[PDB]
Every structure is written in C-alpha cells, then in structure tokens.
Write a protein that binds this ligand. Structure first.
Ligand SMILES: Cc1cc2nc3c(=O)[nH]c(=O)nc-3n(C[C@H](O)[C@H](O)[C@H](O)COP(=O)(O)OP(=O)(O)OC[C@H]3O[C@@H](n4cnc5c(N)ncnc54)[C@H](O)[C@@H]3O)c2cc1C
Ligand SMILES: Cc1cc2nc3c(=O)[nH]c(=O)nc-3n(C[C@H](O)[C@H](O)[C@H](O)COP(=O)(O)OP(=O)(O)OC[C@H]3O[C@@H](n4cnc5c(N)ncnc54)[C@H](O)[C@@H]3O)c2cc1C
Ligand SMILES: COC1=C(OC)C(=O)C(C/C=C(\C)CCC=C(C)C)=C(C)C1=O
Ligand SMILES: COC1=C(OC)C(=O)C(C/C=C(\C)CCC=C(C)C)=C(C)C1=O
Lengths: 463, 463
C-alpha cells in the first residue's frame, strides 16, 4: 500500500538505486532538466572507499572521507529527491521498487508537495527508467565463524568497530605481564586478502604501531604481530610480477607475516584454522591466534539482485551480477540498467569501472532525451546510431605502509608511470587527492595529512 | 584489598585527583624530579571547556578540543603514572585513596614494574601529599525531571547526545506539515542559564540554523525557536551593566527569546513549567514546549568531597566545596590540598581561578622541596617565609553568536580592552587560541575555523 507517483511534470522519471560510485557519478552527469531524478539508498552519504583503510587507525578522520548526498543534489539544476531507505524488491512487471525503513525524505529545489509518510512505512516508487547500482556485499565463501568474530572492511561503521576492538585489546594486554601468551594473542591482528584493500589495511595498522604506539608504550609495540593471508601464490596479482615482488619484500621488511598459498578453513573466537599449500604440493595445517580479524576478500550479489534473477526469464543463469548488454542495458528488461559491482559485463569490480560506466550511461541518456520516440525503447538505441561502452583501463595503485607505494598508470595501449617506492608514495597522494569527488572532502584529507606530519594520529576508542 | 605502594625511590609521592584545569595546570608546573607524581581520573584526556559549546553543532570537532593526558606526562622529565579510574573514598587517617572501575594503567618513563591488576578490581593508593581537583558536578536544584529529559553541557558525551537529539527532531519535524503544532515543538530548543555557557550554547545553535540549515531546508529553519531562561534580572551579570545590555539586545536581534526573572519549577517530557517574576512584583506561570533541553546552570559538590566532610572534624560545616587556607591547604588536614571548583576559597568557580591556584601551589611545592624538614608539615610553611595566594582577575569573555562577542580584560587595578562586537569577536578568537594548552589542539581548531569559512559545519547524527 501507499504509492508515490510524482509526474505532473512532462519529463520521464529516472530512478537511481544506491549512493556509491556508480550512483553519484551518474547523478553528476545526468541532465536533471531533461529527467526527474530520484535516489533510493539507506546511506545518506557518499563514501570514498579507497581511503577507508586509513580510517580505523586515525590517519584520516571518518568525516573527512564522506560527503552527504544533498550537497551533490544541490549543485544540480533540476529537481532531485532522496528516499533514505533500502530497496527490498525490484518489480519489472509493475515498473516499481519496494522500499523499507524510511528514516528521512529530502526534496531539493522542490518547494511544493507533501508525501504524508510515517517512519518505517512500506511503499512503492513508480519509474520510467531504472539505474541499478546497489553494489555487492562481502563474501565469506561459506566459511563458518567469519560473521561471528570477523570485521568486514566495507563501511564507516566497520572502521569504528575495528578501532574499538583493537583499542580494547591494547588496554587489556597492557595489564598482563610481558611473558603471558594471552598478551601475545591480544596483540595479534589478522587481515584476510592479498589484494589492495588487505595490503593497505595491514600497512596502516603497522604505521600506527611503529609511529604512534611505540612513542608511549614501546613494550606493547614490540610484541604486536600482523598477519596477511592470501590463497593465491602472489600478492596483488593485478600488477606485473616485478611490482608484486617488491610489494611482498617490503611488507616483510616492515615486519608483517605474509601467508601465501593459504586458504582459511574455519574461524573460531580466539584463532583461525588455515590450510597452506606448499611448493612440493603438500598441504599443512596451522593455527593462527588473533585478537582482531579483518576480512577483506571478495564480493557476492545482494538479496535484491538475487530476487531479480527469478523474475526475468533470461536473468535465471546469473550469479556474480546482472547480465548486461554492450550498452549496459539489463538483458530481458525493457528499461532497467545496471552499473558497477551489481552488474556483470566481464569487467573487474572496481571504482574505475563504476565511474566510466556511469559517465557513458549518463552521456547516452542526455543524448536519448532529444528524440520524439523516447518522449519500444530497446530498438531506438540502434536506429539513431551511437556507440557501445568501451572500458579504458587506467591502471592500478596501492599504498604499502611506511611511505611506500606501487603504481601502474596507462591509457589503452601506452603505459607511463613511476611505480617504485617513496616517489610513487608522493604520486599516490596527489592522484588520490585529485580523484576525490568534492572540495570539502579534499580539504579535510589535506588537513588530516598536514596534521599527521606534526602531531601523529588521533586514536580514541570512544570517538 | 590490594595496595599499590611505589616508594623504592627516596622522593615524596604527590597524588593528583582529576584531569581538568587544576590537575593538568598543576602537572605542567610540578617538578617531577623532586616528587613522584601520579594521576587518578576516570577521564583519559583533558577537555578545553570554553570551546565545548561549539562542539554539538560542529563549529569545532570534539577531537579538536581534547588532549590525551599521556602527551602532557610525556613532556615531563621524571616519572608519572596514570590510573584510569575514579576516586571513591578519601582516607586521611590511612593516607590513601580508594579507587573503582580500572580501565587502564599507563607508566611513562618507568620501564620496570608490574602491578598485577585485573580490570574493575578495587584498590588503595598510598600518598605523602594529596592535591584534590575533581571539580564539581551539575546542580539541578532538586527540580524534578531535569535528569530524565535534560542534557547537561559538561562533557564530550553530552555534546554527542545533544547532536543526536536535535538531528532526530529535525528529521521527524520535516515529515510533518507546516502547520502541525508537533512540528513546532520538535523544532523548539531551551537553554537554562543566563551565564556565558548558556549564552554561547544559544549562539552556536542559532548560528547553525541561520547559516547551515537554511541553505538546504529553509522551511524548517524559519520555524525553529530558541529560548534562554535565567532567574536573575540580568544576563551575564559578571560584566558591567553596559555590556550586559548590548548582550541582551543582540541575542533578541538574532531572534532568540530571552526569559529573564524566570525560575523553572518542574520539567516534563514535552515541556517545562516556569514562574516569571514581573516588574510590578506579580508572578505568572507559563508553559514552554520543547524538543531539546540544555541545562547549563551552576555547580554542586561531588560525592567524594561530601564523604570527606564527615571524616575531618572541622570540615563538617562545608557545602559548596572544601574549606581552605590562604595557602590552599585543606583546613584540618596535615597534607591534603584543594584547587579548582572542588575547593572553597571565596573565589568564583572558573577556569582562570583553577589555573592560577594550580601554578601557585605547584610553585610552592618546588620551593618546599629544598629543605631538610620536608624530606609537622603545617608549621614549616611559615617558618621558612613565603607568600600566600593572591588571585589576579584578568576579566571575562563571551561569544554571542553571529560573529559578535563581549570582552573585559584587566590586571588587578587597571582595565584595558576592546569589548564591543565584531572586532571583539576577532580578539575573542585570538585569545582562546592563545590559552589552549597544547599545539595539536591549537592547530586542530585553527583548521576547523578555516574549513568553516569555506564549507560550513559538519552536522552528522551518527558521527
Ligand atoms: C575498503 C575498500 C577499498 C577500495 N579501494 C579501491 C581503490 O583504491 N581503487 C578502486 O578502483 N576501487 C576500490 N574499491 C572498489 C570500489 O569501492 C567498488 O568497486 C565500488 O564502490 C563499486 O561501485 P558501486 O556503485 O557498484 O557500489 P558502491 O560504491 O559500494 O555503492 C553501493 C551503494 O548502494 C547502497 N546500497 C546497498 N544496498 C542497497 C539496497 N538494498 N538498496 C539500495 N541501495 C543499497 C550502498 O549504501 C552504497 O552507497 C574498494 C573497495 C573497498 C571496500
Ligand atoms: C561548557 C563550559 C564552559 C566553560 N567556560 C569557561 C570559560 O569560558 N572560562 C572559565 O574561566 N571557565 C569556564 N568553565 C568552568 C571551568 O570548566 C571549570 O571551572 C574548571 O573545569 C574547574 O577546574 P577543575 O580542575 O576544578 O575541574 P574540571 O576542570 O571539571 O576537571 C575535573 C576533573 O576531575 C575528574 N573527576 C571527576 N570526578 C572524579 C572522581 N570521582 N575521581 C577522579 N577524578 C574525577 C574529571 O574527569 C575531570 O578531568 C566552563 C565550564 C563549562 C562546563
Ligand atoms: C581494488 O583494487 C584497485 C583497482 O582495481 C583492481 C584500481 O583500479 C585502482 C586504481 C585507482 C582508482 C581506480 C581510483 C578511483 C578513480 C576514480 C576516477 C573513481 C586501485 C588504486 C586499487 O586499489
Ligand atoms: C564561566 O564564566 C567565564 C569566566 O568566569 C566568570 C571567565 O573568566 C572567562 C574568560 C575566559 C577564560 C577565563 C578562559 C580560561 C583561560 C585559562 C587560562 C583557564 C569566560 C570566557 C567565561 O565564560
């Protein structure tokens, strides 16, 4: 019950799902004069995910790396409306999306209507076109105990939980005598994932220990131990072998214990069971004690996308994400589009792919809105003549702790970069500053870093 | 049970209670080479209380106006030890202090001993001399319902509660239609207290409304209403009448409803009952609806100080604080000293009084530690010949919202200042920056303000 249908305006309604890289990038490029745009997302702000790993340890403040949606919508010319709630069910036949847990409603540049909605009231939102960018969720691979004792590294709350756990453990450990094995376990951290997120997480945690903790509790600092576990035989496999090797050496020089060729079998309250697969082809078992477990491995489709597979006939055989055209239209649907991690197009699940797809699609919509036929929809994309999406891989970046990073930079064919260590660390900072989406967030992180040069990190457990 | 008694060292032990203005100021001046210093306080950091009223609304970040104790202790030459716990009982006869709720132990410049203490374990701490600076706690004057529905404005947690309440109310109000009286109550704020803390609190809240809220929800911003209630007939009575008048005019120009000659009789869930005492000597009743109640009135002795009145014979007739000498020694005690709000010496309860008493006392201790007799204690203060404490009133300051402040600056006899409006607002900033106790906190607030010039306040309900 309750159906919101704003269409006194003669414009078509483009409904967006999410407030991440795909949704915001699309929002920034979509012509709000041609269409009435509306966003649905339980998250009232945009997260700059590449700096998330610096948040727990206080290299950057959590407020520094987020930006309210309304600030993006405010710079838009036309009307934009944000429903603070999550999409539960996508309804192709009805052309609606069901919502749950209404926390707020914002209607920018729309001084007129009144919805008449109580909080947590179920509803249905009409649409003419739908862009789906809810993203994925973390994958535990069905390995028991991960959700009970692990911390994912996906969202701002996760940064606060990791700080609270680790601060708690440091306080406890400090009361026990230098020998105690419990002291040793409480000071043990385990990051699962050999990719960029995991490496950066181990790097930042190590930075905090060597730089901040050592200055007022050197005793505790010496006994802390950080493990990095990865199933593949090479860390950061998306780079050339030469850069991966340097990466692995450096991590071990900064005293991080790297566990390659290693899968996790089970996760318990105080330890995890791992199977390591050696060069001679033999498998061994080892226990890894821990006090804080960061889970930074791959992705899995969300319940809303899974529920959509059952409804569209040709979307049956789909698991990783939604099956999509060369034009980023959802296969089998008349008007549903998909971008980012929640959409399969044989491309990686990365922020670079989300942004470029978002722009492409936004560009097309602004082109599509200059025709009588768009004012049935599938054949019109071709007749008028315009190009499909061509991803342009720009490369990869990764901070490795202790003022060192690796970089590969390119455009299509040619490659040009500086990807060693300290100088690449400086390039790394500049580029990241450059690709932050807002000026406020950019000044905030700049100040965080200036402050970090002179005074070192804030690491409060209650804040 | 369990008694910690560190005295392998030949030095006397000066035990400090608290981590506020008196304790930290004393700590910075006490010679750690002459004495073994130890702090007991449940709060692991120092709070810069004059900027606390800018925290809720995000003019300054909560992290910006606090500084961990260990940073102060680290700059000290000798040994310093901090017990993260609260003093429960002061024991003159035994010369000990009982403690509760052990969260942590820090022993800076002391790479040796091990206490062997579990968390939340009761204990007793030996001492030779004791400096008491626990401060006071808020006084509700026995007016019912204050602690049930009000927010005190005393500590960092209070800043977070006020933001959470107010953000919640704004979100709710926004869903109701422009008429609704509930909408009007949810947008109503009430600050109790005509002194500086209360005035500043009303000013900051009004700044947030006019500057930030109006830019994205002008409709809500116009209907917000802020009340200031004060029992005395004049706001900010500690200034000359001429400055108080300007203060009151300005507050009313910025659309704040000031209620003078008004006492609060009772506080309910959605309103408060007040009695106003008019010029013709008649008393009236009025209800003041509200959604957020900030209680910023006076002080009251803490249970630890009250419990000490019963034990010392001549400390019986004492209520506001501990009765104290011209040398700041506790009357009736051999070795207990009191500074700040928890000590009565016919002086105001202000930060300026705490700092000067702290220095005086610290100075004396460093002088007292160059004699055979100090190596019984009461008569030695006089025989060697040195002066009593003479407070030097430097004046008063107060921000009044909308870039205006009042100032009175002086030293003893002479008075010299600039105490009008906008120019006094600039002086106000400089002086406050100048009397922050640490460089980190000083840069942090400076950056907050630079950021505030270009981008306006962060006002997140979860952060
Ligand atoms: C810690 C970390 C670091 C990373 N670092 C990098 C990096 O350095 N470089 C790089 O290229 N890539 C990086 N990535 C990858 C990148 O963040 C993702 O690939 C990208 O966010 C995917 O874009 P998206 O819009 O599909 O999903 P997201 O950006 O995750 O956004 C999804 C949005 O949908 C919302 N949502 C969730 N569920 C629902 C629902 N049911 N209904 C409605 N809305 C919903 C969420 O609130 C969120 O705002 C990183 C990822 C992580 C976790
Ligand atoms: C919002 C606000 C604004 C203010 N502005 C000004 C101003 O502009 N100018 C001015 O001069 N004054 C101002 N004051 C007054 C000033 O903060 C106090 O007068 C001052 O704090 C008193 O110093 P103190 O050390 O006695 O107590 P505090 O500074 O309050 O410190 C008390 C310390 O004792 C600790 N403690 C409490 N109970 C126990 C216990 N049982 N055991 C151990 N430790 C304990 C606390 O954690 C705290 O660290 C302001 C106060 C407030 C609340
Ligand atoms: C998760 O692994 C990573 C990628 O994918 C496997 C990347 O591609 C890049 C390259 C950096 C990007 C794309 C920053 C985002 C830029 C914009 C314009 C949004 C990094 C650093 C990375 O760590
Ligand atoms: C509680 O009312 C207040 C006073 O007392 C009646 C003051 O005197 C001042 C003046 C500012 C001070 C004293 C800052 C404190 C500085 C140090 C070094 C402790 C302010 C602002 C004030 O609000």
């Amino acid at each position: 019950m309750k159906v919101i249908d704003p269409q006194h305006s003669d414009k078509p309604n483009v409904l967006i799902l999410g407030s991440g890289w795909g949704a915001i990038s699309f929002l920034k490029h979509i012509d709000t004069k041609k269409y009435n745009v509306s966003i649905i997302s339980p998250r009232s702000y945009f997260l700059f995910t590449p700096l998330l790993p610096s948040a727990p340890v206080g290299t950057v403040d959590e407020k520094s790396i987020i930006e309210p949606i309304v600030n993006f919508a405010l710079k838009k010319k036309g009307n934009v409306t944000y429903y603070e709630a999550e999409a539960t069910s996508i309804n192709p036949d009805r052309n609606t999306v069901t919502i749950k847990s209404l926390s707020a409603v914002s209607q920018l540049y729309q001084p007129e209507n009144h919805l008449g909605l109580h909080q947590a009231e179920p509803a249905e939102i009409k649409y003419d076109y739908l862009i789906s960018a809810v993203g994925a969720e973390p994958n535990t691979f069905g390995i028991p105990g991960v959700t009970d004792y692990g911390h994912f590294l996906k969202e701002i709350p996760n940064s606060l939980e990791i700080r609270r756990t680790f601060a708690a453990n440091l306080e406890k450990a400090n009361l026990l005598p230098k020998g105690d094995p419990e002291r040793r376990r409480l000071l043990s951290i385990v990051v699962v994932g050999g990719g960029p997120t995991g490496v950066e997480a181990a790097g930042e945690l190590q930075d905090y220990v060597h730089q901040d903790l050592r200055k007022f509790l050197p005793a505790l600092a010496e006994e802390v131990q950080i493990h990095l576990v990865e199933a593949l035989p090479i860390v950061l496999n998306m780079f050339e072998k030469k850069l991966s090797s340097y990466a692995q050496s450096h991590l071990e020089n900064t005293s991080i214990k790297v566990h390659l060729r290693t899968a996790v079998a089970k996760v318990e309250e105080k330890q995890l069971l791992a199977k390591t697969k050696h060069e001679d082809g033999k498998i061994t078992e080892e226990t890894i004690p821990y006090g804080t477990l960061i889970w930074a491995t791959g992705n899995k489709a969300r319940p809303v996308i899974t529920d959509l597979f059952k409804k569209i006939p040709e979307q049956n055989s789909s698991k990783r994400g939604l099956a999509v055209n060369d034009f980023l239209q959802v296969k089998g649907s008349n008007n549903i589009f998909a971008i980012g991690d929640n959409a399969f197009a044989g491309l990686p699940p990365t922020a670079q792919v989300a942004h470029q797809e978002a722009e492409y699609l936004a560009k097309n919509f602004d082109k599509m809105a200059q025709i009588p036929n768009f004012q049935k929809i599938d054949l019109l994309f071709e007749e008028n003549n315009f190009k499909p999406f061509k991803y342009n891989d720009l490369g990869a970046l990764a901070y490795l702790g202790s003022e060192r990073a690796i970089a590969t930079i390119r455009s299509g064919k040619r490659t040009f970069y500086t990807g060693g260590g300290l100088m690449t660390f400086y390039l790394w900072r500049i580029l990241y500053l450059s690709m932050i989406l807002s000026a406020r967030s950019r000044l905030k992180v700049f100040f965080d870093w200036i402050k970090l040069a002179f005074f070192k990190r804030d690491f409060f457990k209650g804040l």
